[PDB]
Each structure stands twice: as structure tokens, then as C-alpha cells.
Amino acid sequence: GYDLSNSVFSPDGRNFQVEYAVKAVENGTTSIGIKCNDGVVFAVEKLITSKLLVPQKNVKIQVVDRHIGCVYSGLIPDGRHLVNRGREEAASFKKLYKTPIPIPAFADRLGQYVQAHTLYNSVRPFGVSTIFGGVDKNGAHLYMLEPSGSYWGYKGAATGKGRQSAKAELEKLVDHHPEGLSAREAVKQAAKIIYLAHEDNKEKDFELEISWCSLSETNGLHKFVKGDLLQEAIDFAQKEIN
Template identity: 60%
Template sequence: MNSGYDLSSSTYSPDGRIFQVEYANKAVENSGTAIGLRVKDGVVLALEKLVHSKLLVPGTNRRIQTVDRHIGIATAGLLADGRHLASRAFDESLNYRETYRSEPPLSAIAERLGLYVQAYTLYSSVRPFGISAILGAVDKDGPALYVVEPSGIYYGYNGAAVGKGRQLAKTELEKLKLSELTTREAVFEAARIMHLVHDDSKDKEFELELSWIGAETNGLHLPVPKDLFEEADKKGRDALDADMED
């Protein structure tokens, strides 16, 4: 049906589609779910990292990374592409600091990443990135959350979800009054949603990753402390068990 129009990301089909970009979106859909919550005093990022082998060391190959002191990134899709984009985000943030001698706002980093990702949809010698990235920060304008798609398009969100369980996660996010939640409350909601969306795909075990930025971290992007993480993880499992009993 594609008749060769999917052989290059620089070729349009007769109905105006770029199949290589659509295939990149499919790569994201085959990955674990990632969500971001922009609440009244900060941002929480959560990710479902599927464990493909019992031989892997727990806690390695993290998919939530820090690209600046106040900016975190969570990626769903191909792991290597996510690492590359996180590295690019770090370089763009460093370039902004060197150029303007100030802390980069997340909107500027999202715009630069969007342009970079979009450039990889223009030439036949490269392929689109097989990832969607959620960027979270607390900058001079307050909490901010952006999503960069494989096409290069980027949007600002109050709550965002990408990956395999994105539809169910979005439904749960829409039920929350995000503007009234604190980051600590959002951590528990994020853990609950992660366990809920994984229930639909029991084929693999998963590791939960949680990070936050806000008043409790002095504006820094940091992993959620171990005691809070374990409490949120346990409550997420308990909430899922209670739903299954009902």
C-alpha cells in the first residue's frame, strides 16, 4: 500500500503522509509508559521501565535523566535515541547558559529540541528519532511541562503521557485537579497511575522511576527519596489490588 513512499523520511506519500515519522511513533507506542504532572508547586515525572531480562541489574539504564539542575527528561521509545536526545538537551542548556549567562527556561530548551528532532525528518540520510520526550522544570516562570514528539512538534501540558499505556494514563490524569496538588501528593498519584497502566500489559515486569522538581528539592531535579518512593510504590500496588477486588 505504501508503494515505496516509506523508504525515506524525506518523501511524502500522495496523501501527504510521512510514513517514517509514523513508524517512529509506533516505536514509542511499543515502549513503557511515561507521564508528567505539572502541579501547583512543581513537576513530577514517572516512568514504567520494562524489564526484559531477570539478569539486568536493578536501577541501571535509567530513562529519566537530568539535563540541567532544574530540568528533567523522561523518554519513551528506543533507549539509545533517548540517551542521545538527553545529551543534546544538556548541550543546548549549557549553550544557553554560556550565551545568556542565565538559567535556561524550559520553553527555550523544548523549542531547540523540537527543531533538532524535526531536522531528522528532512533528509534521506537520517531517520526520525523513535522516542517521545517529556521535559519538566521549575524555572523563572514557575512549573513547566513539555512533550517533544518524533515529528519535532512540541506542546506545553499540565499533564502528559506517552508510550504504550498513554490513553489510560491520560484518562486518569484528566480526573485529577493538578493545579491543586502538591508535588508530594502528585508522587503518589503518579505511582498509582503507573501501576494501573501496567496492569494491561502483564507480559513483562517493570521498574518504577520517579523524579520531582519543586519547593521540596529547592528547585532541583532529583530522584524521589527512597522512603517516599517505597511508600508511593506500595500505595500504588495496594490501590491496584483494591480495584481488582472491586
Template identity: 60%
Template sequence: MTSIGTGYDLSASTYSPDGRIFQVEYANKAVENSGTAIGLRVKDGIVLAVEKLIHSKLLVPDSNRRIQTIDRSVGMASSGLLADGRQIANRARDESYSYRDVYKESPPLKELVQRMGLYVQAYTLYSSVRPFGCSTILGAIDKSGPVLYIIEPSGVAYGYHGAAVGKGRQLAKTELEKLKLSELTTREAVFEAARIIHLVHDDAKEKEFELEMSWIGAETNGLHLPVPKDLLEEADKKARDALEDYDE
């Protein structure tokens, strides 16, 4: 991360001579060093999955969640700094409540993502703040059907059929591209998401991790809910077995 001259990374409001904002690039590095998060947009819903790395055996299982509910039908998965992800989730809830208060209906995800993109981008403009060190995947079912977006630390947002952020994003994207997402059901997507998370974690075997998943679809009546424990355990077991067969 060198540039022409020095000192251009001391403030988020300073460009380097070659037109880069180093603090935004450092924020992206924070995401790349975190556990992988993926989102799948399938024919009848959305599935979110996160590789939650366990840094200590003393941590309580299922605590410090990286998947959060924003609105009844909107879920968010984050990769990067956990505290930054929580701040973005809280702001997204405020924006959702504000839209509902004015228009008396749930916000379309596109509108919510535009507002959140502006909020995140504002933190790249001033020397008194720093960019958010996390990328978020937002998924929902609204009037147009299932929708999926990523918001990056720079504030830019993209719509995706299959999204991946974090340490194993490149391998995860490769695996997502092999799937016919428009033909999968949410239940089938749960098993595929578990397989991909286990596959990308295989490169960092020295650390244990928890598989965290949620879904939105017909089976949840359009609500964002955690994947039922029995289905999650079944998907987790199948993914481990598939990985062992692959290794052999």
C-alpha cells in the first residue's frame, strides 16, 4: 500500500497523487481478513450464510451474531469489523422505520440500500471520521421478488444473484457461478450455501468456525428468520461429508 510520497493515508478526505483514498482501501483489507459471508438469490427467496470464526474456546456458542434482521422481510449479513456491522444494522433499522412511518409500508430494498450507501459513503468524506471496516450483504423479498445487494466500505452498492464478501470471496464466487441459482429452491440453497462456506474455510483449517444461516422465502411466509436448527445441522453434516469425499 505505497504511493507517490507519504502521508496520504492519514485522512479519509485526502487523495493520493494517483487518485486513491488509502483509508477506504484499508477498510477493504479489514473485510478481506474477516470470515466469509455469502448470499444466494434463488427462485423463491434468499439465503444468507456466514463463516463465523471462533477466536476463543471461551466464547458462548451462537453469540456475537453476524446475521441480523433489519425489517420483517429484510436480512443483513456482514463481514469485517463486528462493531461496524452492528452500527450499519442499527442505522438500516432507523431508515426502515423512517420509511415505514412516512409511507405506511415496508421499504423496497433498493430504496433502503440507496439510503445506506449514502450513509456509508459520508464516512469517506471527512478527516474526523474513518470509513466503515465492513461489507454488508442485504437480502429481501419485496414487490419485485427476491433481491440481493452488497454495500462496500466505499458506499458503492451492487445488485447480485449470488454475492460473497470476506476472506474466501474469490473461491465462493467461483462456486456460486457454477450454480443455476434461478432454478434452486431456498431449501436446496441452504445445502449449497453450507457446502460453499465449508469449502472456503478449508484454506484456514487452523481456526474453528460456526456456520450461521438465515433465509427468507415461502417456508418463512416472507419473513427473515434463522434456518431451523435441524435443517442447519443436516446441511452442516452434509457439507462436512462432501468436503471429506472431495479431499479423498
């Protein structure tokens, strides 16, 4: 019984519910966040379930404000509620203080919302991990938010099934470039480790979506990488894994 809910406590410091929420996020697809010098670059592995689908017509990276990219894994519907909530909170701050929200401020807000869902009998703690960042005027920042309401700064973060492949390769990238790398050069890097993170997920086929927010390419807005730039990334990675 004391292993069933969130308002319970147990004399092991465990609160079994919340730990079970990580297990939800562990069924998700790989999502990485590459922190570069100029901004942030997200990419998500998007499973192609069937050849019946209409392709490139589902976005798992949703914008909050005009400058904070948000991409999440775990329960897809559950995550859509958390993003809607952070779009309310962004909009409240934009009115009350007439500037686009800082990212350490966006962090406070979301952080509070999921923490809330471990203190009542009548709620369930959300089982999603978010990865969100952008450019504000104090510079680019990146945050990963655990379903437990835990978060930290990050020069590279990931979550998903293929968080195993992805993490080791991010170590490789801070030891390649310990003085950082360009946001343009990092499009090709997000392609490379999303492809490698589909060797823990090779029972299907997938589509790669890449988006960026960097100061120096997009004027500090959260945009998608699209057209011919996007296929250069696909080819690059495709040839390394062959």
C-alpha cells in the first residue's frame, strides 16, 4: 500500500510512484539536446508506425513563446498538457512584465507545476521528461526536467530509450570540442546520434525532425530545420552508420 501513491512516504526515502514515472519516460523515443555556443539544437526520433501515415505532419517539438523550444518523451498525451500549461505561464509573464520570459524563469514555473502533482491524493505525477531551451538576453540556456521535478543546467542532456547510446556519444562531443562547437556544425551532430540511438529501437523505421534556436542563424527564434539543410543532415549520418 505504502508502495502505491504519491502522498505516501516509506522509511526507505522512496516514494514509489514518482520512481515509477521514470519507467514511462523509458518507453519514449530518444530525444537529445546539444548545447552549442550560439543556442540549442533539439532533434527527436519520430517512429514511423505504418506506411499508411501522412509523413512530416506530426510535430513532437512544440514552441512555447517564440524563443523557447520544448520537446518531451514519455506519455505523448500527458506531455501535451504540460506544454499547454507552460504556454499559459509564459503568456502571464509576457503580460505582467512586457518582455519575453527568461529561461531560468521558465524553469521555475514548469518546475513547480510537476512538483505539485506529488503532494495530493487526488493527482498523479506526470510521466514525462522535457528538454527546453532557447536564447534569451542573458544568453542561451538548457534545462532537462525529470518527472520527479528535478532539473539542472546541462551542456548536453538526453532522455528516451536510447539515452544509453546518446549519453556516451555526448561525452565524446565535449571531448571533441571542449571549447564548444557551432550551431550550424551541430545540425550534423544531432543527425548522427539520433541514428545511432535507433540501434536500440531497430524493430521499426523512423523520421528525423531537427529544430534549432540559435542567435546567429534564426535571430533567437525557435524555428524548424527544413528543406535542403535537413536532408544534408540525413545523408551525413546515413553514410557513417553504413
